Amino acid sequence: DAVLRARAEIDLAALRANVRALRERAPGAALMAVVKADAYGHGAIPCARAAVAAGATWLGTATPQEALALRAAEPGLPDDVRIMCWLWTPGGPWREAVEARLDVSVSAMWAMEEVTGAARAAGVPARVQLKADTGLGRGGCQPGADWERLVGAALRAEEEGLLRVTGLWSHFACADEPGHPSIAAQLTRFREMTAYAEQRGLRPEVRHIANSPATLTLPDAHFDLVRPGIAMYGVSPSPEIGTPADFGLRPVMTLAASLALVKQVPGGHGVSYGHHYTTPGETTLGLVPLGYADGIPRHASSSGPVLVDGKWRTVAGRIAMDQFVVDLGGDRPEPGAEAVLFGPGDRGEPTAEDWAQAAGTIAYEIVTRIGSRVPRVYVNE
Amino acid sequence: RDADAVLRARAEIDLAALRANVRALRERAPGAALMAVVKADAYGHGAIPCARAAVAAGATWLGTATPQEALALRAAEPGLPDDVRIMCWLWTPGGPWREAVEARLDVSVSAMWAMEEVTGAARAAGVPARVQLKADTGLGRGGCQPGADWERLVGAALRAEEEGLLRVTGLWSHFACADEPGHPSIAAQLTRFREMTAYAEQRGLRPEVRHIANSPATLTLPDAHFDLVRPGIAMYGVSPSPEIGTPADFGLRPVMTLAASLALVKQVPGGHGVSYGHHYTTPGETTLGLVPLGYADGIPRHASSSGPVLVDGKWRTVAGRIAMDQFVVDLGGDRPEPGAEAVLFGPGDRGEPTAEDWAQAAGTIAYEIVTRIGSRVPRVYVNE
Ligand SMILES: *Cc1c(COP(=O)(O)O)cnc(C)c1O
Ligand SMILES: *Cc1c(COP(=O)(O)O)cnc(C)c1O
Ligand SMILES: [Cl-]
Ligand SMILES: [Cl-]
């Protein structure tokens, strides 16, 4: 019913194909299926099921709310599966997390005190992962005095039987630019900081630093576990890394819509807000009923590609809240016709990366921000 | 329980400001009814709550894009007044035209396929349709072109009225350049709206309302008001354009405040990079604040290195790239406690940035800033 306007087709078979492709590239490691941000706009639970089915033994989320929803899923995901969440703030539901058997990242002393406190109240121990700041400079614990202290506080919490440090981990800043100096720097600092913590008595199940581009291009970086997010959704972290086809990967999301309106307009007739496109001669206009409220970026005004009626069209002028227009040369498809904004590539459609370029951003943002008003349709469940 | 997800971040929706705005707007358009446009989840502010507030303060029409949005308004519990008019315009073939006619929605029709589908549905349902013909005055998006197409649509509508299947309750259009005051096209569209409406009345159509006015029109063009105004963005207290003015210039107060709690405050040496691609490196020794919102939450990635955030009493600006769930600010050397409030935007009166300030940092319009705040950011409603 709502699918008639537009839809995001989520091909869960492609997803499973990707997870397998990725388990091949990282043969000596477990794979985490990162399903944060509603599985990058693809649907958290469905994608998480598919990714376990195909060999993911860890799930990854940002917020603890996301991770708890995975654990509350009906039907249940395997209870034996590990679920990690990293984005915590003071007063967060640390108790509910320890009870639900989540792996929780800790990168700072306030969090260590809060998680330890919660393990006491709950009675059962915590699974904690220390985040090390290797150079990224976002979240993460800085080396030297802060790391010393956190490693130590973790060691005491292990003594007292309140938690076991199940991992040591970090994140790359520039892995998507292959052979950039910082990659090697962060990597040897990850080895120093991990070595230090093991040398002082911590015994983790897993070390991990690898995001998608790392996983694809740096076998040194794999360690016990990989976190290829975007690559699991079949999209390349960077055109410098390669196409999805280069790594045996197939895009999972196809974004399509039905033409609301096909109409003939004379020449010198403006199109959309600010009249930033006026028709060159007499022509036809197609109304695609998706706009920036649906996550069609407004930066892709005048540039965004759409396959309509067998040819690539491009957005004519500005993108509105709910709609945009394409110039159809003089072609006259029936209203209701399919307008495919992006997909895998094999039916002549543009890809998510093509929209990333039109909008001056990364493909990550294109898929993740597809609006909740666009219903998701799941195929090959 | 849900008082747990607010700790990371929240969008505070001040429904009293919204009611203040709907009144300010009814004042600017004294000879007209006001439609509260609550499309796109009330521009990211929450459709139903805002719709209630807007009715409370004098809106006698509600406006949506999709028929799904409008049907949800009609299904609201507790109910909105049954006497209130709800219009929806963004239709595609095979859409739920029957459910719309039954639910007593005003439906836009701008094309012959739709006229046939809506008429067909009125037959099946047995009760007549309320239809609004959309006229293409110059915008060139979804209306009916003048001349041969308008002639035909007006005529098909007239026949449908004869047969008792629908009554054309409105004739309407939309401005392309009203946000740029005195642009030539405004006057052009407006006189073509008068020609096309005159034509349809002259041929026997008798509408309840003519309307063309969006927010900027409503604020700057009393000629444009006609029977009804559709000020969307202005109702949420944000100015359609800095060229039109500030919200304060029109007695309007922004409804959404977007705030978050610092996840991390930490000291880093100089020459230490920040975020993806190392597009900010620290000038000397300094402090970094982690704000736990990213582009998945609708913090535009175009506002990398530029986005303003009030933290600890001073405006900070985004340090380098915005990630999926987080960004960093350079805090000089200040050391606020983690859990401290980071206000990204609001009304302006506590020293915060506004939605327009983010629009500029990201190279876009404020409309996009508020509308695309993610569903993973819980909304908190105050003064309901
Ligand atoms: C976002 C994220 C990932 C996956 O993202 P890619 O860049 O697609 O690999 C992995 N790990 C962490 C900690 C993240 O925050
Ligand atoms: C978007 C929209 C509006 C509101 O425009 P503002 O500039 O936000 O006031 C009004 N009417 C229709 C038909 C719309 O699509
Ligand atoms: Cl980090
Ligand atoms: Cl139009």
PDB file of C-alpha atoms in Angstrom, chain A residues 91-282:
ATOM      1  CA  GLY A  91      23.505   7.291  33.995  1.00  0.00           C
ATOM      2  CA  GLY A  92      23.036   4.956  31.026  1.00  0.00           C
ATOM      3  CA  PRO A  93      21.388   1.520  31.498  1.00  0.00           C
ATOM      4  CA  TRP A  94      24.607  -0.286  32.533  1.00  0.00           C
ATOM      5  CA  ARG A  95      22.735  -2.697  34.834  1.00  0.00           C
ATOM      6  CA  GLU A  96      20.276  -3.791  32.086  1.00  0.00           C
ATOM      7  CA  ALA A  97      23.291  -4.311  29.797  1.00  0.00           C
ATOM      8  CA  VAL A  98      25.236  -6.479  32.299  1.00  0.00           C
ATOM      9  CA  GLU A  99      22.003  -8.502  32.967  1.00  0.00           C
ATOM     10  CA  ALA A 100      21.364  -8.908  29.200  1.00  0.00           C
ATOM     11  CA  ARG A 101      24.995 -10.175  28.805  1.00  0.00           C
ATOM     12  CA  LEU A 102      26.189  -7.433  26.500  1.00  0.00           C
ATOM     13  CA  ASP A 103      29.800  -6.645  25.798  1.00  0.00           C
ATOM     14  CA  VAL A 104      30.236  -2.962  26.761  1.00  0.00           C
ATOM     15  CA  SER A 105      33.016  -0.632  25.666  1.00  0.00           C
ATOM     16  CA  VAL A 106      34.681   1.441  28.365  1.00  0.00           C
ATOM     17  CA  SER A 107      37.223   4.081  27.401  1.00  0.00           C
ATOM     18  CA  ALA A 108      37.217   6.302  30.463  1.00  0.00           C
ATOM     19  CA  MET A 109      37.298   6.083  34.221  1.00  0.00           C
ATOM     20  CA  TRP A 110      33.722   7.360  34.931  1.00  0.00           C
ATOM     21  CA  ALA A 111      32.407   4.426  32.825  1.00  0.00           C
ATOM     22  CA  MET A 112      34.583   1.882  34.599  1.00  0.00           C
ATOM     23  CA  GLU A 113      33.133   3.073  37.937  1.00  0.00           C
ATOM     24  CA  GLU A 114      29.565   3.042  36.630  1.00  0.00           C
ATOM     25  CA  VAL A 115      29.788  -0.423  35.025  1.00  0.00           C
ATOM     26  CA  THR A 116      31.509  -1.945  38.079  1.00  0.00           C
ATOM     27  CA  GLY A 117      28.867  -0.374  40.315  1.00  0.00           C
ATOM     28  CA  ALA A 118      26.156  -1.948  38.132  1.00  0.00           C
ATOM     29  CA  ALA A 119      27.757  -5.416  38.213  1.00  0.00           C
ATOM     30  CA  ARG A 120      27.607  -5.273  42.076  1.00  0.00           C
ATOM     31  CA  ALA A 121      23.947  -4.299  42.067  1.00  0.00           C
ATOM     32  CA  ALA A 122      23.139  -7.008  39.510  1.00  0.00           C
ATOM     33  CA  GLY A 123      25.231  -9.732  41.172  1.00  0.00           C
ATOM     34  CA  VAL A 124      26.476 -11.135  37.793  1.00  0.00           C
ATOM     35  CA  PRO A 125      29.792 -10.061  36.234  1.00  0.00           C
ATOM     36  CA  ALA A 126      30.279  -7.614  33.296  1.00  0.00           C
ATOM     37  CA  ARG A 127      31.876  -8.277  29.930  1.00  0.00           C
ATOM     38  CA  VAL A 128      33.945  -5.136  29.194  1.00  0.00           C
ATOM     39  CA  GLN A 129      36.031  -4.018  26.250  1.00  0.00           C
ATOM     40  CA  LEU A 130      38.616  -1.312  26.720  1.00  0.00           C
ATOM     41  CA  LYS A 131      38.718   1.144  23.805  1.00  0.00           C
ATOM     42  CA  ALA A 132      42.205   2.406  23.049  1.00  0.00           C
ATOM     43  CA  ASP A 133      42.793   5.754  21.297  1.00  0.00           C
ATOM     44  CA  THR A 134      45.420   4.856  18.727  1.00  0.00           C
ATOM     45  CA  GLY A 135      45.378   8.221  16.873  1.00  0.00           C
ATOM     46  CA  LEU A 136      41.736   8.705  15.834  1.00  0.00           C
ATOM     47  CA  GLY A 137      41.200  11.156  18.655  1.00  0.00           C
ATOM     48  CA  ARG A 138      37.459  10.604  18.940  1.00  0.00           C
ATOM     49  CA  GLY A 139      36.304   8.284  21.702  1.00  0.00           C
ATOM     50  CA  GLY A 140      38.984   5.999  23.102  1.00  0.00           C
ATOM     51  CA  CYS A 141      41.455   6.128  25.954  1.00  0.00           C
ATOM     52  CA  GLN A 142      44.698   8.133  25.382  1.00  0.00           C
ATOM     53  CA  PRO A 143      48.020   6.254  25.870  1.00  0.00           C
ATOM     54  CA  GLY A 144      50.338   6.635  28.925  1.00  0.00           C
ATOM     55  CA  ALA A 145      48.778   7.883  32.193  1.00  0.00           C
ATOM     56  CA  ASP A 146      45.071   7.317  31.251  1.00  0.00           C
ATOM     57  CA  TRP A 147      45.660   3.815  29.782  1.00  0.00           C
ATOM     58  CA  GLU A 148      47.834   2.802  32.787  1.00  0.00           C
ATOM     59  CA  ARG A 149      45.083   3.779  35.134  1.00  0.00           C
ATOM     60  CA  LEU A 150      42.197   2.164  33.187  1.00  0.00           C
ATOM     61  CA  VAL A 151      44.072  -1.082  32.649  1.00  0.00           C
ATOM     62  CA  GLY A 152      44.748  -1.080  36.402  1.00  0.00           C
ATOM     63  CA  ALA A 153      41.190  -0.310  37.425  1.00  0.00           C
ATOM     64  CA  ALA A 154      40.078  -3.100  35.106  1.00  0.00           C
ATOM     65  CA  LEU A 155      42.585  -5.518  36.719  1.00  0.00           C
ATOM     66  CA  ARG A 156      41.197  -4.740  40.205  1.00  0.00           C
ATOM     67  CA  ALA A 157      37.634  -5.186  39.015  1.00  0.00           C
ATOM     68  CA  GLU A 158      38.695  -8.634  37.680  1.00  0.00           C
ATOM     69  CA  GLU A 159      40.284  -9.482  41.088  1.00  0.00           C
ATOM     70  CA  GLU A 160      37.042  -8.498  42.838  1.00  0.00           C
ATOM     71  CA  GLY A 161      35.154 -10.674  40.319  1.00  0.00           C
ATOM     72  CA  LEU A 162      32.880  -7.886  38.988  1.00  0.00           C
ATOM     73  CA  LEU A 163      33.933  -7.968  35.335  1.00  0.00           C
ATOM     74  CA  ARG A 164      36.130  -9.742  32.843  1.00  0.00           C
ATOM     75  CA  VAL A 165      37.838  -7.679  30.159  1.00  0.00           C
ATOM     76  CA  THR A 166      36.725  -9.623  27.087  1.00  0.00           C
ATOM     77  CA  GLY A 167      38.359  -7.334  24.494  1.00  0.00           C
ATOM     78  CA  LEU A 168      40.837  -4.575  23.668  1.00  0.00           C
ATOM     79  CA  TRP A 169      39.955  -2.511  20.672  1.00  0.00           C
ATOM     80  CA  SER A 170      40.385   0.568  18.504  1.00  0.00           C
ATOM     81  CA  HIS A 171      39.296   2.217  15.265  1.00  0.00           C
ATOM     82  CA  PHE A 172      41.186   3.550  12.252  1.00  0.00           C
ATOM     83  CA  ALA A 173      41.061   7.207  11.117  1.00  0.00           C
ATOM     84  CA  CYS A 174      42.385   6.905   7.534  1.00  0.00           C
ATOM     85  CA  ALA A 175      42.132   3.209   6.476  1.00  0.00           C
ATOM     86  CA  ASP A 176      39.942   4.261   3.485  1.00  0.00           C
ATOM     87  CA  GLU A 177      43.031   6.072   1.958  1.00  0.00           C
ATOM     88  CA  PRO A 178      45.277   3.029   1.329  1.00  0.00           C
ATOM     89  CA  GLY A 179      48.856   3.263   2.646  1.00  0.00           C
ATOM     90  CA  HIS A 180      48.302   6.685   4.344  1.00  0.00           C
ATOM     91  CA  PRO A 181      51.033   7.038   7.051  1.00  0.00           C
ATOM     92  CA  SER A 182      48.619   7.133  10.089  1.00  0.00           C
ATOM     93  CA  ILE A 183      47.368   3.562   9.301  1.00  0.00           C
ATOM     94  CA  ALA A 184      50.774   2.026  10.131  1.00  0.00           C
ATOM     95  CA  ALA A 185      51.193   4.451  13.098  1.00  0.00           C
ATOM     96  CA  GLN A 186      47.830   3.617  14.708  1.00  0.00           C
ATOM     97  CA  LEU A 187      48.498  -0.066  14.068  1.00  0.00           C
ATOM     98  CA  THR A 188      51.882  -0.206  15.906  1.00  0.00           C
ATOM     99  CA  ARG A 189      50.433   1.925  18.717  1.00  0.00           C
ATOM    100  CA  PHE A 190      47.551  -0.610  18.927  1.00  0.00           C
ATOM    101  CA  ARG A 191      50.233  -3.340  19.330  1.00  0.00           C
ATOM    102  CA  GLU A 192      52.077  -1.335  22.065  1.00  0.00           C
ATOM    103  CA  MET A 193      48.901  -0.575  24.050  1.00  0.00           C
ATOM    104  CA  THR A 194      47.510  -4.130  23.747  1.00  0.00           C
ATOM    105  CA  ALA A 195      50.939  -5.612  24.688  1.00  0.00           C
ATOM    106  CA  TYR A 196      51.056  -3.382  27.773  1.00  0.00           C
ATOM    107  CA  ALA A 197      47.615  -4.539  28.995  1.00  0.00           C
ATOM    108  CA  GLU A 198      48.293  -8.253  28.471  1.00  0.00           C
ATOM    109  CA  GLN A 199      51.709  -7.842  30.082  1.00  0.00           C
ATOM    110  CA  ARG A 200      49.937  -6.472  33.201  1.00  0.00           C
ATOM    111  CA  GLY A 201      47.601  -9.503  33.480  1.00  0.00           C
ATOM    112  CA  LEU A 202      44.574  -8.813  31.266  1.00  0.00           C
ATOM    113  CA  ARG A 203      43.466 -11.849  29.173  1.00  0.00           C
ATOM    114  CA  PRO A 204      41.005 -10.824  26.445  1.00  0.00           C
ATOM    115  CA  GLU A 205      39.026 -13.089  24.130  1.00  0.00           C
ATOM    116  CA  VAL A 206      39.488 -10.661  21.237  1.00  0.00           C
ATOM    117  CA  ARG A 207      41.684  -7.846  19.942  1.00  0.00           C
ATOM    118  CA  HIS A 208      40.174  -5.786  17.085  1.00  0.00           C
ATOM    119  CA  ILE A 209      40.772  -2.651  15.060  1.00  0.00           C
ATOM    120  CA  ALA A 210      39.401  -3.367  11.647  1.00  0.00           C
ATOM    121  CA  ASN A 211      36.586  -1.545   9.970  1.00  0.00           C
ATOM    122  CA  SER A 212      35.508  -2.310   6.353  1.00  0.00           C
ATOM    123  CA  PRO A 213      38.474  -0.779   4.414  1.00  0.00           C
ATOM    124  CA  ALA A 214      40.942  -2.314   6.863  1.00  0.00           C
ATOM    125  CA  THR A 215      39.306  -5.776   6.522  1.00  0.00           C
ATOM    126  CA  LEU A 216      39.495  -5.571   2.723  1.00  0.00           C
ATOM    127  CA  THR A 217      43.092  -4.237   2.402  1.00  0.00           C
ATOM    128  CA  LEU A 218      45.089  -5.028   5.618  1.00  0.00           C
ATOM    129  CA  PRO A 219      45.464  -8.647   6.707  1.00  0.00           C
ATOM    130  CA  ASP A 220      47.908  -7.448   9.452  1.00  0.00           C
ATOM    131  CA  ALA A 221      44.940  -5.557  10.963  1.00  0.00           C
ATOM    132  CA  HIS A 222      42.508  -8.508  11.332  1.00  0.00           C
ATOM    133  CA  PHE A 223      43.609  -9.868  14.719  1.00  0.00           C
ATOM    134  CA  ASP A 224      40.878 -11.975  16.449  1.00  0.00           C
ATOM    135  CA  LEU A 225      37.885 -10.057  15.045  1.00  0.00           C
ATOM    136  CA  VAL A 226      36.740  -7.766  12.180  1.00  0.00           C
ATOM    137  CA  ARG A 227      33.943  -5.170  12.081  1.00  0.00           C
ATOM    138  CA  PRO A 228      33.135  -4.622   8.418  1.00  0.00           C
ATOM    139  CA  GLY A 229      30.007  -2.492   8.441  1.00  0.00           C
ATOM    140  CA  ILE A 230      29.461  -0.823   5.125  1.00  0.00           C
ATOM    141  CA  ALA A 231      31.011  -3.716   3.196  1.00  0.00           C
ATOM    142  CA  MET A 232      28.392  -6.067   4.678  1.00  0.00           C
ATOM    143  CA  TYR A 233      25.711  -3.850   3.052  1.00  0.00           C
ATOM    144  CA  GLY A 234      27.570  -4.370  -0.197  1.00  0.00           C
ATOM    145  CA  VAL A 235      28.902  -0.782  -0.504  1.00  0.00           C
ATOM    146  CA  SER A 236      32.575   0.121  -0.910  1.00  0.00           C
ATOM    147  CA  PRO A 237      34.071   2.252   1.857  1.00  0.00           C
ATOM    148  CA  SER A 238      35.832   4.357  -0.857  1.00  0.00           C
ATOM    149  CA  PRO A 239      36.278   4.317  -4.658  1.00  0.00           C
ATOM    150  CA  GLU A 240      40.075   4.419  -3.914  1.00  0.00           C
ATOM    151  CA  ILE A 241      39.657   0.989  -2.129  1.00  0.00           C
ATOM    152  CA  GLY A 242      37.582  -0.289  -5.088  1.00  0.00           C
ATOM    153  CA  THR A 243      34.129  -1.186  -6.364  1.00  0.00           C
ATOM    154  CA  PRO A 244      31.992  -3.728  -4.513  1.00  0.00           C
ATOM    155  CA  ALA A 245      32.523  -6.113  -7.480  1.00  0.00           C
ATOM    156  CA  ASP A 246      36.336  -5.973  -6.771  1.00  0.00           C
ATOM    157  CA  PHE A 247      35.726  -7.645  -3.384  1.00  0.00           C
ATOM    158  CA  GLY A 248      32.871 -10.030  -4.325  1.00  0.00           C
ATOM    159  CA  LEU A 249      30.257  -7.745  -2.776  1.00  0.00           C
ATOM    160  CA  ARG A 250      26.725  -6.805  -3.877  1.00  0.00           C
ATOM    161  CA  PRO A 251      24.765  -3.774  -2.657  1.00  0.00           C
ATOM    162  CA  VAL A 252      21.876  -4.779  -0.392  1.00  0.00           C
ATOM    163  CA  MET A 253      19.559  -1.740  -0.749  1.00  0.00           C
ATOM    164  CA  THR A 254      17.636  -0.802  -3.883  1.00  0.00           C
ATOM    165  CA  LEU A 255      15.738   2.546  -3.549  1.00  0.00           C
ATOM    166  CA  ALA A 256      12.890   2.907  -5.996  1.00  0.00           C
ATOM    167  CA  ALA A 257       9.707   4.889  -6.527  1.00  0.00           C
ATOM    168  CA  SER A 258       6.763   5.231  -8.857  1.00  0.00           C
ATOM    169  CA  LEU A 259       6.286   8.287 -11.039  1.00  0.00           C
ATOM    170  CA  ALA A 260       3.442  10.402  -9.630  1.00  0.00           C
ATOM    171  CA  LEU A 261       3.258  12.632 -12.707  1.00  0.00           C
ATOM    172  CA  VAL A 262       4.362  12.800 -16.302  1.00  0.00           C
ATOM    173  CA  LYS A 263       3.613  15.996 -18.119  1.00  0.00           C
ATOM    174  CA  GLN A 264       4.618  18.129 -21.054  1.00  0.00           C
ATOM    175  CA  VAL A 265       5.866  21.643 -20.441  1.00  0.00           C
ATOM    176  CA  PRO A 266       6.939  24.346 -22.926  1.00  0.00           C
ATOM    177  CA  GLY A 267      10.455  25.812 -23.114  1.00  0.00           C
ATOM    178  CA  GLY A 268      11.574  28.557 -20.713  1.00  0.00           C
ATOM    179  CA  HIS A 269       9.414  27.050 -17.947  1.00  0.00           C
ATOM    180  CA  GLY A 270      11.113  26.840 -14.549  1.00  0.00           C
ATOM    181  CA  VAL A 271      11.388  23.705 -12.406  1.00  0.00           C
ATOM    182  CA  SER A 272      11.267  23.481  -8.595  1.00  0.00           C
ATOM    183  CA  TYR A 273      12.278  26.022  -5.859  1.00  0.00           C
ATOM    184  CA  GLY A 274      14.323  29.080  -6.919  1.00  0.00           C
ATOM    185  CA  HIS A 275      13.822  28.130 -10.632  1.00  0.00           C
ATOM    186  CA  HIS A 276      17.372  26.581 -10.791  1.00  0.00           C
ATOM    187  CA  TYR A 277      16.396  24.597 -13.884  1.00  0.00           C
ATOM    188  CA  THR A 278      14.376  26.033 -16.779  1.00  0.00           C
ATOM    189  CA  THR A 279      13.449  23.767 -19.701  1.00  0.00           C
ATOM    190  CA  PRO A 280      15.680  24.229 -22.820  1.00  0.00           C
ATOM    191  CA  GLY A 281      12.893  23.649 -25.377  1.00  0.00           C
ATOM    192  CA  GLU A 282       9.590  21.781 -25.194  1.00  0.00           C
TER     193      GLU A 282
END
